[PDB]
Amino acid sequence: SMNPPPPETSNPNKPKRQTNQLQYLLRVVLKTLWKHQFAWPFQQPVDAVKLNLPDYYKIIKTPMDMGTIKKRLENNYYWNAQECIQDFNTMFTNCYIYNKPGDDIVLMAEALEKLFLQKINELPTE
Numbered sequence: 001s002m003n004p005p006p007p008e009t010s011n012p013n014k015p016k017r018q019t020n021q022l023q024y025l026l027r028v029v030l031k032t033l034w035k036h037q038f039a040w041p042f043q044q045p046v047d048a049v050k051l052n053l054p055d056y057y058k059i060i061k062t063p064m065d066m067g068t069i070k071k072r073l074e075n076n077y078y079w080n081a082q083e084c085i086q087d088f089n090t091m092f093t094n095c096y097i098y099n100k101p102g103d104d105i106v107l108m109a110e111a112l113e114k115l116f117l118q119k120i121n122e123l124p125t126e
């Protein structure tokens with residue numbers, strides 16, 4: 001099986017804006033997670049071909065990753081902070097669906113998610 005195309009990251013038919021929350025999500029949240037020691041599985045779409053995961057895209061229909069999120073932020077793809085937050089949550093959830101408790105990748109997701117949630121608790125005002 002081929003990989004699916006990656007998620008879209010730019011669309012000139014959507015309106016654009018910068019908000020203080022979206023700024024925080026790129027400059028604080030995304031950049032803090034990106035440099036973490038456990039970021040590496042999450043920095044690009046899951047390459048099911050290269051990683052020998054032939055059922056990955058049979059199970060995961062809404063793939064998401066932080067490379068995609070970073071590009072979406074940088075391209076003003078998101079209008080609402082919640083859309084971005086949702087993408088992070090999808091990314092974690094997919095990892096929990098496909099993998100099992102105690103897998104190394106799950107433990108890495110958990111740690112990154114706890115950090116994510118801490119930072120989201122510190123989002124500034126609308």
Ligand SMILES: Cc1cc(/N=N/c2ccc(S(=O)(=O)Nc3ccccn3)cc2)c(N)c(C)c1O
Pocket residue numbers: 040041042046051094095098099105
């Ligand atoms: C999200 C997710 C990601 C997964 N793998 N992601 C990977 C992402 C990148 C690599 S890498 O370029 O070899 N870089 C490495 C490999 C090992 C250690 C540090 N960096 C390997 C795997 C994976 N195998 C599953 C099952 C997942 O659910």
